[PDB]
Symmetry: D2
Subunit: 282 residues, 4 copies
C-alpha cells in the first residue's frame, strides 16, 4: 500500500493528469516513472483509458460515471494521475516540470492542480472538512482493498467565495450543515445540507470513505480539490448520486455556490517490496 | 426551425455555455432571453440538466455519453447553450457580456468559445472540413426532425499544430485521409484515417449529419469547435464510438494530434410564429 | 515607405513584440525575417534596445518616455515589433507561430495582441475613433519623415466596459467629448474630455498624427490597441503629457474607465527597392 | 519602522499593486486600509503617482527609472503597494480579496503576485540568494532612513528554467558567479556574472541594500519577485544600471535566461505609535 493515509499531510500538493497520445512511447516513459513512485512523496493512479489501451481490464476500475441529474458533475477521465505531496511548494513545481518532460511524448499533461492544505485541514470557506473521517485504525479498513489497492475519485470544485461569504451566517451554516462558529452539527438543518446529504451512517447498505482533499487557487478561480479514497467506488458514487438528487429529489446545498470542474476514477496500484506493483496491468 | 443551416455562415461565432445554479431566478432570465432568440443571429439549445431541473423530460435529449475507450472524450454537459453568429467579432463580444448579465443570477457562464470561420470553411491544419456535407436539399432532411427540432453535439478539440505540421506531408494526409495539396481522398489510406473512420456511407444502418464547426483560439490553445446537427444523436454517437475504437479496435488518427476538451448534447427547440418554441418544456 | 497608411485597413491585425536575449543568433534571425517584411501584410518597427544592442544610434529613436504624473502610462519598451495585417484571423495566428519559431533563439516573444477592426473603425464603447484623422493627402505629410521612415507609438489600453456603459449617456459623452448618438463634438464639454485634451489644433507649436488603432480581446480583458504614426514622437508625446495632466493639472477623462497596460516607441524603417531598408542600423 | 526586516520571513507572501482611478473615493478607502497596516503582516508602500495625485511631493520618492540600455527593464509604476506576509497561503488569498473590495472604487487591483519562500531563501534555479545580505545589525543601517522610512524597488523577473537548467553546470555557475554545488564564489568568473556585476563592495561610492525577494508561479510562468530595500533608491539604481551595461558595456548574465516583467519604486512610510505614519502625505 502507498502512503495515501499518512498523517500529517504535507502543507502542499500537486495533482497531475496525463492523456495517452503516443502509446508506442509508453514503455520508455514507464521505465523512468515507476522507479520514482515511492507512494509517499509521489503517488500513482491508473485511469480506465490507460487500462483499456493496454487491453487488460482491472477489476473495479471504470471511468468517472455520467449522472443524468439537475446538477453538473463532469466526467473528465484521464489516463494517468500523479499525486505529489511535499512541504516545499517550489520543489513540487520543479518536479512536475521534470515529470512532464520524462513522460513525453507518450503522455501529455492534460490537467494540473497547485494544491495547499489550508489551516491544517480547513476549506477556504472556513468550515473544517475532514471532521467525520474514520479513526486512524478504521482508515485502512475503509480505504484499502484486499490486494492493497485503493480506488480514488478526484473532483475539482470551484467556489464562488464572494457569493457564499455574502450570505448571512445562518444561510452558510444551513448549506454546510455545521455552525461556522463552533463546528457543531445543525441537527435541524435542511436535508439539503451537505452533512445531511453525506451522512456516512445514513446510507443503509454502504460504508465510509477516506477523504484527502486540499485547497487550490488558479487562474480558473479557487476552491477544493476533492479526493475520496476507498476499497471501491461504491461509497463515493452513492454519495454523489445522493448529493445530485438522484436518490431523492433533494439537491445538495453545495451546488448553490460551488460546482465541480473535473471528475475521474483512478485505481491506485499496491506497493510491493520493489516499488509500485503494476503487475496485473503488465 | 432556426437558422442552423443558413449559407454562408458568418465570419465569426461565439458559443456560450451556462450552469443553472439559482433555479428560483430562472423565470426572470427566460423572460429576457427568449425574445432575443431569433434563430439566425442568436440560437438556443437546451441541455439535459435544464430539462431534468424542470421535471419535464424531452424525447431524444440526454447528456453527452460516457465512452469507456482508449481515447478521452470528456462529458462536460451544461444546462444552456447560446450560439451567436455574426460578421463583427466585437459585436459578439459585446452581446455575450449583455447576455451574461441578463442571465444572472439564474445561469452562470460555465464556458465560452470565441470562434471564427477560417478561410470560408477550412481547419487550421489547412484541410477543408465540410466537403462531404449533404447537399443543400439533403441538409434539412438529415438535420431537422419531425417537429422542427435539431439535436446538436458540441466538442471543443484542441490541436497540437506544432506537432501535426512537423510530420511529413504523407503522414498528415494519412491521418486525415485526404491529400492537403488537392483535397482528394486517399483510397488506400489506413482505416484509422479520419475520413475512413467517419465515412458516412460506411455505417450500414445509420444516416448522415450536418456539421457547422468553426475554428477557435484561446489561452487554452487553438483548434476546432466541432458542431454536429441531426434529427437525433444516433448519427453522431455511432461516429464517435467508431472513432474511439469501440466498433473495432481501430482508433481514429485525429487523437494523435488533437483531443476534445469538452462535450455536450443539446436539444435545439423549434421556431414557432412567435419566437422560439419551448412549449414542451413549459 | 511601408503600407502603414493603406485604406481600407484589413479586418484583423496581430501585434508581436520580441525581447532580444541571445544576440549571437540575431544574424540568422534577420536573414529569415527581412525577406518577409513586405510593408503591407508584415510591417516592422525597430525598438531602442535593439539599436542600442548593435551600438548604432538611430536619430529620433528612443525608449517610451517616463511620465511622472498622476496617471500611469507604463514604459514596456521591447526590441522588435511585427505588425501583421490581414482579413483572415486564422492566417495571422498561423503566421505568428511561424514567425515565433524563425526568430528563436535570438528573439523571444514578449507580447502578442490579437486585434480586430470593430465596425470599420469604431471603439468597443461605440465611439467612432479616427474621425479627425488627416485627409488622405495630409496623411503622408504628417506620418512620414524625410527618408520615408515613420515613428510609431504603441499603447495597449484596457477598458472597463461594464463601468463605462453603466454611466449615463451624458457622462459617457463628457468623457469622450462627442455625442454617441451622432458623433458631434460637445463644444461645452469639460476640458478633461478626450477630444478637448487631444484637439490636434489646440497644440500651438505641434502638428498632427496618423492613428491606426484596432480593438483587442484577451484573457487580460478588452480595449483599444492604440497606434500613433508620425514623422517624430513629438506629436504623440505632447499629447500624452497633455492627457496625463503635465501641461496643466487637467487629467484626461479616459483614465476613469481605461488605462494603458503597455507602451513603446518603435522606428519604422523605410522600404527600398529591395525589401525593408535597415541600412543605417547595418 | 515597519517589519521589513523581521527574521525569519514567513513561508508565503502576496504582493498587491493598485491603480488610482476614482480619486474622490480615496478618503473612504484610506480610512479602512490604514487601521490594518500593522507593518508585520500587512506592509504599505506609496508610489509616485499617488503622491503626485495628492499634490504633496515626498523627498526621495520618484517613479521607476527608464534605462535606455540593451536590456529591457520595464517601468510599471503603480500608486499603491500592499505587502502581505504569512505562513498560510490560503489566508493571504482570502485577505487580498477582502483588501480588493475595501479599496474599490478608489483603487483597482493592477497586479498581484502569489509568492513563496523557496527552501528558506533559495531561487528556483537552486542558487541561494541572500547570502551577501548585510548582517542583522547592518540591515537597519542600510535599509532605514532618518525618519524610519524605507525606499523599496520591486521587479517581477520571469525565468526560463527549461533553458537555464539545460545548460552545463559550468555555464550556469558562470552566469550566477557562484558554484551550485557549494555556493562558493567563482573568483575567475566573467565580469558578466551576476555576483560580479552586483558586488556590493565593487561600487566605489555607493552602499549596500537589503533584499527580501521571494519566488513566484503564475500563468505568466515562474521566477523571482525581487525586493530591494534601502535608505534611498541610489543603491538599487546604480546596481541596475551596472547590470544593464550602462556603467560599462558588460551586460549581466541573468538577462540570458530571465527578464523583469514589472518595475516600480515605492516609499514605505514609517510606523508611529498609532499605526502607519502617512502624515507628510496628509
Ligand atoms: C465543494 C465541495 C465540498 C466541500 C466544500 C465539502 C466540505 C465538507 C465539510 C465542511 C464537511 C464537514 C466535515 C465533517 O463533517 O467531517 C464535509 C463532510 C463530508 N463530505 Fe464534503 N465537501 C465537498 C465535497 C464532497 C463530495 C463531492 C463528497 C462525496 C461525493 C463529500 C463527502 C463528504 C463526507 C462523506 C462527509 C462526512 C459527513 C459525515 O459523515 O457526517 N464531500 N464536507
Ligand atoms: C479535431 C477534430 C476534427 C477535425 C480536424 C476534422 C476534420 C475533418 C476533415 C478535414 C474532413 C474532410 C472533409 C470531408 O470529407 O467532408 C472531415 C470529414 C468528416 N468528419 Fe471530421 N473533423 C473533426 C472532428 C469530427 C468528429 C468528432 C466527427 C464525428 C463524431 C466528425 C465527423 C465527420 C464526418 C461525418 C465527415 C464526413 C466524411 C465523409 O463523409 O467521407 N468530425 N473531418
Ligand atoms: C483608451 C484609449 C483611447 C480611446 C478610447 C480613444 C478614442 C478616441 C475617440 C472616440 C476620438 C474621437 C474621434 C475623432 O475625433 O477623430 C479620439 C480622438 C483623438 N484621439 Fe484618441 N483614444 C484613445 C487614446 C488616445 C491617445 C493615448 C492619444 C494620444 C496620445 C489619442 C489621440 C487622439 C487624437 C489626436 C484625436 C483627434 C481629436 C481631434 O483632433 O479633435 N487617442 N480618440
Ligand atoms: C532574476 C533575478 C535575480 C536572481 C536570480 C538573483 C540571484 C542572486 C544570487 C543567487 C545571488 C548570490 C547570493 C549572494 O551572493 O548573496 C545574488 C546576489 C546579489 N544580488 Fe541578485 N538576483 C536577481 C536580481 C537582482 C537584481 C535586479 C539586483 C539589483 C539591481 C540584485 C542584487 C544583488 C546583490 C546586491 C547581491 C549581493 C552580491 C554580493 O554582494 O556579492 N539581484 N543574486
Amino acid at each position: 500500500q502507498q502512503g495515501l493515509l499518512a498523517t500529517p499531510v504535507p502543507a502542499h500538493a500537486r495533482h497531475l493528469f496525463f492523456t495517452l497520445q503516443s502509446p508506442e512511447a509508453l514503455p520508455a516513459a514507464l521505465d523512468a516513472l515507476l522507479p520514482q513512485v515511492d507512494g509517499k512523496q509521489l503517488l500513482l493512479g491508473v485511469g480506465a483509458p490507460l487500462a483499456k489501451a493496454l487491453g487488460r481490464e482491472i477489476p473495479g476500475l471504470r471511468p468517472f460515471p455520467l449522472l443524468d441529474a439537475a446538477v453538473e458533475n463532469p466526467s473528465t477521465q484521464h489516463a494517468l494521475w500523479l499525486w505529489l505531496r511535499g512541504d516545499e511548494r517550489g520543489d513540487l513545481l520543479l518536479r512536475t516540470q521534470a515529470l512532464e518532460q520524462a513522460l513525453a511524448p507518450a503522455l501529455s499533461l492534460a490537467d494540473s492542480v497547485d494544491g495547499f492544505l489550508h489551516r491544517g485541514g480547513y476549506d477556504l470557506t472556513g468550515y473544517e472538512d475532514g471532521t467525520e473521517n474514520p479513526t486512524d485504525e478504521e482508515v485502512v479498513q475503509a480505504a484499502i482493498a484486499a490486494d492493497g489497492s485503493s480506488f480514488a475519485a478526484f473532483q475539482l470544485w470551484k467556489h464562488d467565495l464572494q457569493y457564499f461569504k455574502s450570505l448571512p451566517q445562518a444561510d452558510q451554516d444551513n448549506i454546510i450543515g455545521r455552525r461556522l462558529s463552533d463546528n457543531e452539527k445543525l441537527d435541524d438543518a435542511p436535508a439539503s445540507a451537505h452533512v445531511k446529504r453525506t451522512a456516512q451512517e445514513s446510507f443503509e447498505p454502504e460504508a465510509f470513505m477516506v477523504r484527502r482533499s486540499v485547497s487550490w487557487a488558479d487562474q480558473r478561480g479557487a476552491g477544493l480539490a476533492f479526493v475520496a479514497l476507498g476499497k471501491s467506488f461504491e461509497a463515493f458514487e452513492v454519495q454523489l448520486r445522493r448529493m445530485s438528487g438522484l436518490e431523492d429529489g433533494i439537491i445538495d446545498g453545495l451546488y448553490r455556490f460551488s460546482r465541480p470542474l473535473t471528475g475521474g476514477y483512478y485505481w491506485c496500484p499496491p506497493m510491493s517490496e520493489t516499488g509500485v506493483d503494476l503487475s496485473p496491468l503488465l
